[PDB]
Structure 1
Amino acid sequence: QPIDADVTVIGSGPGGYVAAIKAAQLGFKTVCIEKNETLGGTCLNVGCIPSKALLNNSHYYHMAHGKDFASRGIEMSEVRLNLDKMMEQKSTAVKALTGGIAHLFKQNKVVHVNGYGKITGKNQVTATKADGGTQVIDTKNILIATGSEVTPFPGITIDEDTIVSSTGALSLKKVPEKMVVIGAGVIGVELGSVWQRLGADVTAVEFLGHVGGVGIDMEISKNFQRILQKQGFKFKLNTKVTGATKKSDGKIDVSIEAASGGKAEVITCDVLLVCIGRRPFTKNLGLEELGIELDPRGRIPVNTRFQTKIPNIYAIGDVVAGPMLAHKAEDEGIICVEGMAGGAVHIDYNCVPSVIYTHPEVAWVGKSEEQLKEEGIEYKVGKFPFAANSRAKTNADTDGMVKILGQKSTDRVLGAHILGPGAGEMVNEAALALEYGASCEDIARVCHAHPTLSEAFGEANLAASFGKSINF
């Protein structure tokens, strides 16, 4: 009863489920092992999918309940939130896509093994089911796609009741009266804004001086924070949390101080969301016994084919270095297995976009101004505001700008940074541009349809290339 495979994938998130599918499409006898009830990993079950659903639903709530719909002649006397039903739309979307992956596995003849996978030899993986039953897979290659987990806050114990991670925050049973968020990174700002739109009094506390996490352009970050403050989202930047006490009355007392030191203070809230980071997950996988050592941050070191020290054991996604993003994991999955089959293996982390699905959105790809200064690159800047864009103006949705960074000597686009409507979709045109080594002039000369938000991308590139846009 051992299964014989060519490729055994441990984990079914964006890295592993896509790697399983592609490996099957390339002709490899393929197994995928998953410990959880459903397939899809962090992204589908407790990440990107439920968060974007709540961002969409909460945005439309705000449009209806606030001023926006009345200003377009859509009149309603009495707009009410039904939170159970909003959660149910979220849950339905999750269920359909997790079902979708099960179908795709059958369609592609990927064998799904349920259980906790442990590498029990160079060419062997053992999955242990919840009742203790085992299934052994003897296998040519092993692909580790075990992903990430929440980074705990030392001294504060998450219980998913009143002190929640992202997981708990995606499923609160009612709108909290007061919420504090620790970490103003991408996840914190998205979940904070959801709850703020729905009625919560929300403050994010962040040790650093800016919101939106690592690599966000500083000017874009400042402009983004100012807009969110005007919506009602409060921030205490440059601020340390010392501790948090669960109280007898169900509330929480949170002690903070300036990050440099000084001014202690206590803030009370009904829910504390702890989202200071995420970290690679390799627990009880069998690495120590194989001699595969981790790097100081818990990642598995790999070569450019994604091979560990043991050349038939591979790793991809949130368990390895680079941006902890679902598209990044997916592409590492694809190219790893293409490599197994003898092909070239390339991904360029500089061409991997980041998106924040707030309203307004934020999105960027390539280098920020700060990165270009660190590196000593000589660059120029083009900017165009959405207030001068015809589609944004027609939609009455005009916050933000596109900022382009270009190289003086060659006019090469080095980075694209977008704050405003449609940023998430627009950054894909920018990623193609960076992949192709576009000049700012090339982008300015594309015949962008009129009226589109994309025209602002064209115009900011014109400003960088020629010195001046047309419409501003």
Structure 2
Amino acid sequence: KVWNARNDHLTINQWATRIDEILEAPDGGEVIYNVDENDPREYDAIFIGGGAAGRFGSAYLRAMGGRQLIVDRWPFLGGSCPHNACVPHHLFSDCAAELMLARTFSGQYWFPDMTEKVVGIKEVVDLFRAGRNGPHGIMNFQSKEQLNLEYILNCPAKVIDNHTVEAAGKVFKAKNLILAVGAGPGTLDVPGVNAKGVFDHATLVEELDYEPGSTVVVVGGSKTAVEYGCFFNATGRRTVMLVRTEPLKLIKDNETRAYVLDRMKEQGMEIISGSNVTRIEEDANGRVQAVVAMTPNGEMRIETDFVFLGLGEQPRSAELAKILGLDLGPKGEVLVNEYLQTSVPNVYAVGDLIGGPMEMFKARKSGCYAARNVMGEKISYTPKNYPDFLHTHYEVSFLGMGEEEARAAGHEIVTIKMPPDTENGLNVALPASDRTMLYAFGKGTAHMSGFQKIVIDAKTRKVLGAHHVGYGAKDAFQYLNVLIKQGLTVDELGDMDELFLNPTHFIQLSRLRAGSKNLVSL
């Protein structure tokens, strides 16, 4: 059953409704076929997958006057991001942050008494499931009506060879393939891993048909594990994170990492380093009842009926590699050169399929650079020196070098931080700005008002790294990183116009010290 959608013009909200209908149809729903049957030009590229990489790649290719076709097995464009990855992740992190605020000020002002309050995880997941077609609807609309994309959705692609793809029972030819099928959730090789009650980011939002009990176990120690783990904890649940090595190694600044981990522990999270699950115990109903794990302090058993795996994502390379003869790396990533070209002539690979860093900027940018190459513009892509962030119950942003890292690299350094390093320590009403004001003024809560630091070369006066725990700095790090890569000094930073009270206090604190030829930390 093929719906010829070319000459239909659904609104965003009609698209949202229609996608929902197709997703819910017992038979699997109709194919969405949006192809210009009157255009005689050959396809410059067929994209296998229309997630962040395939969709942006197609948008750019089309903007350059080339012809593209997306094939995606989902009835929407945008891939994992709206459906089960960054979007739900951010809804859950918004909840985690507000819940920490509510629990900190329990029984003060407008805040409800949270003492005995357990928030339903399923309730919030269901809110996500009920609203996720909004972003789906915009993706289908924007792609067709504003970006002029051709696509076939709700259809697994069947790659024939490096120039030939079957979709919707039609065979299409192209000058190139861009492979954009992303990566699937990592798993554990232990008894019980397939028990009901074991989830990952993908299955959480498809299969949670009960409300978890009082204890949650999270496996993993980076972004996904810590993001979902803080949300679970914020709902009122005892949360134990089993971390194979050490948690949050992405936070290179030791003081920043410590603040973040300390705040997580204050919220009641238990974070266990050097630990590996050995078994997930099932009850006689087939649901998880406990997790057994080896740690540096011997075997532990944690009773729980809800386990969340936040391991890495595994590139979806197997089928395509068999068909096309693609060279793969150790973790199954499709090997590419710096023009995104695979070992196979005229076949590019992009997004999570080509491995880490698995981020939206990497996905969209690799998509567009492959598209430029297909359109005859020789352009390399090597992601390097990018800013980064993750959520706990706070926003955590970082770029460049940690303070220790900068010294080990041979730099003489000063730092500018908040709060100052004093006898009263964190227990002072700084740093403060939007969404930290209550922490800053509340009785005994001032230590929660945030932490931040820039790392500066004492000789060149260049800013070598920036680090922030709080709210409202993440967006700023995108732009600040560009200024830093251009060579930003403490002097130039001090010379900017601040917008006080500012999530980053870097500008004015830089100004307080830049009047000196010999720089001193603040």
CA gap of 1:217–1:362, structure 2 versus 1, over 3 A, is: same
Amino acid across the alignment from 2:269: F
Residue equivalent to 1:396: 439
Question: C-alpha separation between the residues in 2 aligned to 1:268 and 1:82?
Answer: 19
Matches within 5 A, 1:290-369: 290-343=324-377, 345=379, 347=381, 349-369=383-403
1:124 aligns with 2:164: yes
Question: C-alpha separation between the residues in 1 aligned to 2:53 and 2:229?
Answer: 27
Question: What SS does the corresponding residue of 2:175 show, helix, strand or coil?
Answer: strand
1:101 aligns with 2:139: yes
* Stretch of structure 1 that moved more, 384-393 or 14-23: 384-393
Of 413, 429, 435, the match for 1:380? 413
Question: What SS does the corresponding residue of 1:391 show, helix, strand or coil?
Answer: coil
Residue equivalent to 1:436: 486
1:113 aligns with 2:152: yes
The Cα of 1:84 is off from its aligned counterpart by 5.9
Amino acid across the alignment from 1:60: E
The Cα of 1:161 is off from its aligned counterpart by 3.1
Question: C-alpha separation between the residues in 2 aligned to 1:444 and 1:9?
Answer: 46
The Cα of 1:29 is off from its aligned counterpart by 1.1
CA gap of 1:163–1:461, structure 2 versus 1, over 3 A, is: farther
Amino acid across the alignment from 1:406: I
CA gap of 1:140–1:276, structure 2 versus 1, over 3 A, is: same
Residue equivalent to 1:130: none
The Cα of 1:351 is off from its aligned counterpart by 3.2
Question: What SS does the corresponding residue of 2:318 show, helix, strand or coil?
Answer: coil
Question: C-alpha separation between the residues in 1 aligned to 2:191 and 2:512?
Answer: 50
Of 158, 164, 169, the match for 2:199? 164
CA gap of 1:60–1:408, structure 2 versus 1, over 3 A, is: closer
Question: C-alpha separation between the residues in 2 aligned to 1:198 and 1:468?
Answer: 43
CA gap of 1:459–1:203, structure 2 versus 1, over 3 A, is: same
Residue equivalent to 1:39: 77
Question: C-alpha separation between the residues in 1 aligned to 2:498 and 2:394?
Answer: 22
CA contact (8 A) 2:158 2:166 kept: yes
The Cα of 1:76 is off from its aligned counterpart by 4.6
Question: C-alpha separation between the residues in 2 aligned to 1:345 and 1:216?
Answer: 31
CA gap of 1:378–1:327, structure 2 versus 1, over 3 A, is: same
* Stretch of structure 1 that moved more, 172-181 or 48-57: 172-181
Amino acid across the alignment from 1:162: G
Amino acid across the alignment from 2:87: I
* Stretch of structure 1 that moved more, 25-34 or 340-349: 340-349
Residue equivalent to 1:413: 463
Give per-residue Cα distances to partners, 1:388-430, cap 9 Å, x unaligned.
Answer: 3352664535533222233444333332222222242232233
CA contact (8 A) 1:251 1:269 kept: yes
CA contact (8 A) 1:382 1:463 kept: no
CA gap of 1:302–1:337, structure 2 versus 1, over 3 A, is: same
CA contact (8 A) 2:414 2:457 kept: no
Amino acid across the alignment from 2:318: K
Amino acid across the alignment from 1:411: R
Question: C-alpha separation between the residues in 1 aligned to 2:355 and 2:487?
Answer: 24
Question: C-alpha separation between the residues in 2 aligned to 1:178 and 1:18?
Answer: 40
Residue equivalent to 2:65: 27
CA gap of 1:265–1:157, structure 2 versus 1, over 3 A, is: closer
After TM superposition, the score normalised by the length of structure 2 is: 0.79
Question: What SS does the corresponding residue of 2:165 show, helix, strand or coil?
Answer: strand
Residue equivalent to 2:26: none
* Stretch of structure 1 that moved more, 96-105 or 376-385: 376-385
Question: What SS does the corresponding residue of 2:77 show, helix, strand or coil?
Answer: coil
Question: C-alpha separation between the residues in 1 aligned to 2:165 and 2:513?
Answer: 56
CA gap of 1:25–1:70, structure 2 versus 1, over 3 A, is: farther
In structure 1, the gaps of 5 or more residues are 128-132
The Cα of 1:47 is off from its aligned counterpart by 0.7
CA contact (8 A) 2:45 2:374 kept: no
After TM superposition, the score normalised by the length of structure 1 is: 0.87
Matches within 5 A, 1:139-178: 139-156=174-191, 158-159=193-194, 161-170=196-205, 172=208, 173-178=210-215
Amino acid across the alignment from 1:312: N
CA gap of 1:402–1:317, structure 2 versus 1, over 3 A, is: same
1:188 aligns with 2:234: no
* Stretch of structure 1 that moved more, 356-365 or 170-179: 170-179
Question: C-alpha separation between the residues in 2 aligned to 1:449 and 1:13?
Answer: 36
Higher strand share: 1
* Stretch of structure 1 that moved more, 393-402 or 30-39: 393-402
The Cα of 1:179 is off from its aligned counterpart by 0.8
Amino acid across the alignment from 1:385: M
CA contact (8 A) 2:52 2:363 kept: yes
CA gap of 1:280–1:391, structure 2 versus 1, over 3 A, is: same
CA contact (8 A) 1:441 1:462 kept: no
Question: C-alpha separation between the residues in 2 aligned to 1:174 and 1:460?
Answer: 49
The Cα of 1:181 is off from its aligned counterpart by 0.7
Of 311, 314, 318, the match for 1:279? 314
Question: C-alpha separation between the residues in 2 aligned to 1:35 and 1:200?
Answer: 36
The Cα of 1:9 is off from its aligned counterpart by 0.9
Amino acid across the alignment from 2:156: Y
CA gap of 1:441–1:279, structure 2 versus 1, over 3 A, is: farther
CA contact (8 A) 1:384 1:403 kept: yes
Question: C-alpha separation between the residues in 2 aligned to 1:281 and 1:17?
Answer: 17
Question: What SS does the corresponding residue of 1:227 show, helix, strand or coil?
Answer: helix
CA gap of 1:156–1:467, structure 2 versus 1, over 3 A, is: farther
Question: What SS does the corresponding residue of 2:43 show, helix, strand or coil?
Answer: strand
Question: What SS does the corresponding residue of 2:488 show, helix, strand or coil?
Answer: coil
Question: C-alpha separation between the residues in 2 aligned to 1:160 and 1:417?
Answer: 40
CA gap of 1:58–1:418, structure 2 versus 1, over 3 A, is: closer
Question: C-alpha separation between the residues in 2 aligned to 1:117 and 1:157?
Answer: 33
In structure 2, the gaps of 5 or more residues are 1-36, 420-428, 441-447
Question: C-alpha separation between the residues in 2 aligned to 1:160 and 1:42?
Answer: 24
The Cα of 1:139 is off from its aligned counterpart by 0.4
Of 283, 291, 295, the match for 1:258? 295
1:427 aligns with 2:477: yes
Question: What SS does the corresponding residue of 1:20 show, helix, strand or coil?
Answer: helix
CA contact (8 A) 1:380 1:408 kept: yes
Question: What SS does the corresponding residue of 1:192 show, helix, strand or coil?
Answer: helix
CA gap of 1:116–1:275, structure 2 versus 1, over 3 A, is: same
Question: C-alpha separation between the residues in 2 aligned to 1:60 and 1:110?
Answer: 39
CA contact (8 A) 1:384 1:460 kept: no
CA contact (8 A) 2:327 2:342 kept: no
* Stretch of structure 1 that moved more, 4-13 or 73-82: 73-82
Amino acid across the alignment from 1:152: T
Question: What SS does the corresponding residue of 2:344 show, helix, strand or coil?
Answer: coil
The Cα of 1:31 is off from its aligned counterpart by 0.5
